[PDB]
């Protein structure tokens, strides 16, 4: 049975106007800006952007990859598919 999300969890993350996007729950670094309550720092593979999102926008990677894990025209997307599959815990700093 599911736990709450934790840093390291791999997901597809949904934002308005984008397709479900390969992404991970980031750790918050010492000195870094904390999310709002009930929100998580989400690192998007490929674009290496961060946004803050609640669980309603977060789709666990393993369950959803068959639906979402497919090339897409958008900039950064296919790079992001490579990262989430081949080195999802790396530093992209």
From Swiss-Prot:
Signal peptide: none annotated. It comes from the Eukaryota. Residues 7-64 form the PWWP domain. Widely expressed. High expression is found in heart, skeletal muscle, ovary and testis. Overexpression is frequently observed in hepatocellular carcinoma samples. It is found in: Nucleus; Cytoplasm. Belongs to the HDGF family. Acts as an epigenetic regulator of myogenesis in cooperation with DPF3a (isoform 2 of DPF3/BAF45C). Associates with the BAF complex via its interaction with DPF3a and HDGFL2-DPF3a activate myogenic genes by increasing chromatin accessibility through recruitment of SMARCA4/BRG1/BAF190A (ATPase subunit of the BAF complex) to myogenic gene promoters. Promotes the repair of DNA double-strand breaks (DSBs) through the homologous recombination pathway by facilitating the recruitment of the DNA endonuclease RBBP8 to the DSBs. Interacts with HDGF. Interacts with trimethylated 'Lys-36' of histone H3 (H3K36me3). Interacts with trimethylated 'Lys-79' of histone H3 (H3K79me3), but has higher affinity for H3K36me3. Interacts with IWS1. Interacts with H2AX, POGZ, RBBP8 and CBX1. Interacts with histones H3K9me3, H3K27me3 and H3K36me2. Interacts with DPF3a (isoform 2 of DPF3/BAF45C). Interacts with SMARCA4/BRG1/BAF190A, SMARCC1/BAF155 and SMARCD1/BAF60A in a DPF3a-dependent manner. This is Hepatoma-derived growth factor-related protein 2. The gene is HDGFL2. The chain holds residues 1 to 93 of 671 of the full protein.
